[PDB]
Amino acid sequence: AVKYLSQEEAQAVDQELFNEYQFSVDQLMELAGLSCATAIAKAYPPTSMSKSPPTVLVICGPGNNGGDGLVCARHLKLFGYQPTIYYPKRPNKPLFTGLVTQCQKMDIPFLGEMPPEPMMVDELYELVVDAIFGFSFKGDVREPFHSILSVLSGLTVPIASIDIPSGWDVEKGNPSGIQPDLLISLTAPKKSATHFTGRYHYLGGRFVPPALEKKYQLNLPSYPDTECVYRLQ
Amino acid sequence: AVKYLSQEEAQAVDQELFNEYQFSVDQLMELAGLSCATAIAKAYPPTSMSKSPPTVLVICGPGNNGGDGLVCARHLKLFGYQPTIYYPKRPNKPLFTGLVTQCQKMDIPFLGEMPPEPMMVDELYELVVDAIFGFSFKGDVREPFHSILSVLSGLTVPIASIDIPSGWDVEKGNPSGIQPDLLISLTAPKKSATHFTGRYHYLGGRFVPPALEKKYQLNLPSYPDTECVYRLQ
Predict the structure, then answer these.
(1) CB atoms inside a 10 Å sphere around CB A138
(2) CATH code: domain of residue B173
(3) Range of the structural domain that residue A31 is part of
(4) CA distance A209 to A75
(5) Contact at 8 Å (CB) between B182 and B158?
């Protein structure tokens, strides 16, 4: 079996990657975001969806998960989806301001407000991507995310979550949280993933040095040939 | 047909990407390098080669082409090749020092000297990747690259060149230059590509905004589904 990480382990691994291996944040974010866009294209391919091109709403939170989200939006566009982004709390750092410009000049729109009703999200967006919080989340969700999650709970279209379903406790999960249909675990799954019950669980972020994966006993599966995602069972 | 760029156009396009679209160098280098590793895995797949794992020598020059090369080495390793790098002139900038550390801690070795004979390269390396010079090359080749190219001319194993065959004039090419077997054109092919006669010509760097590709009339082909390379005919 593949190993499921504690928050401690995840922080240890991610820190190892940036200090010991000296990957820069935008290198891994680029790969992670591409992994997601690809997981999404394998689970919900365009041709298999009613709208042409198919519409996606990507909701990006205030840290790196949200960053993954912007990369993901951008690769989705190139793969033939029509994404829209909602990005309410934007850190003022070059990485993020660059990512925002990139999507903008690719004619990906940033909504000014979340559609206030589940029904409206449903009529406009055939898939929704949860790029709000990731593994370093803790404590009560504060605004505007409390009420964003609340809308999400009511949706009838599928949710795809990046790394962790936002709102779940990173290890123990959340019985009344959002229940996504696709979960892309980056690098390795996290212990909350044991509580996952959607249809699709993909593993992404094919950048793990063998030496890091051996040190932490990750038991990563073999990604087939040149693929950057793997479906778990 | 796809359009073949002048050095002017290529500089115009690459500058547009970094200023107008504000991609950072390490974002596009990451994608370009992955495109290459994938072009190489589609043209020379591991299972189809005598050594197990198959060995590759990646020769990196003193600018961004060489940077593409280090990214490429690194994805090749993950795809199941056993790459070795030769990187003689290393710019002292964080981007490059990071890339070097990454390969190092992935147990990719950097040779201290080029094997001095074509025969020796041939016996040790089943493929050689030319990541020396790209489209901003001009004037006489100076050391150590003059004599590196010279060894390359003598090889009997295949050469894969990134963007341009190093040593060719960027538009007019080079009748007595190296003659690679695979050419990965990044973003768009360059006019020297008309003088290409190897077996495989792939197009890589799937990151072109529609609006940039329309402005310059690139006539990029449709990359199939989620692929990051396309084979030209």
Answers:
(1) 8
(2) 3.40.50.10260
(3) 1-233
(4) 24
(5) yes
The DSSP element (H or E) to which B10 belongs, if any, is helix B7-19
Cβ(A58)–Cβ(A69) under 8 Å?
Answer: yes
Name chain A contacts of B20, Cβ cutoff 8 Å: 105
Distance between CA atoms of residues A160 and A172, nearest Å: 19
Q: How far is it, in rounded angstroms, from Cα B79 to Cα B65? A: 21
Strand B159-162, strand B200-204: pairing = unpaired
Nearest to B133 by CA among B168, B158, B160: B168
Asked if A23 is an interface residue toward chain B (Cβ–Cβ < 8 A), one would say yes
Q: Are the CB atoms for A114 and A87 separated by under 8 Å?
A: no
Is A107 part of any known ligand binding site? no
Hey, what are A37's tokens? 């866009």
- Structural domain count of chain A: 1
**Cβ under 8 Å to B: A residues 126-185:** none
- DSSP code string of A18-60: HHTS---HHHHHHHHHHHHHHHHHHHS-GGGSSSSSPEEEEEE
Is residue B206 within 8 Å of B185, Cβ to Cβ? Answer: no
Q: Confirm if A74 and A108 have CB atoms less than 8 A apart.
A: yes
Residues of B in contact with A203 (CB under 8 A): none
Other C-beta atoms lying within 10 Å of the C-beta of residue A112: 7
Q: Are B162 and B179 in contact (CB under 8 A)?
A: no
- Listed in order, strand segments (DSSP E) in chain B are 55-60, 82-86, 127-131, 159-162, 182-186, 200-204, 230-231
Are A226 and B106 an interchain contact pair (Cβ–Cβ within 8 Å)? no
Start-to-end CA span in chain A (Å): 10
Q: Is the dihedral of CA A172, A68, A157, A152 positive or negative?
A: positive
Chain B residues with beta carbon closer than 8 angstroms to that of A30: 26-27, 30-31
Which of A42, A46, A34, A83 shows the shortest CA–CA distance to A202?
Answer: A42
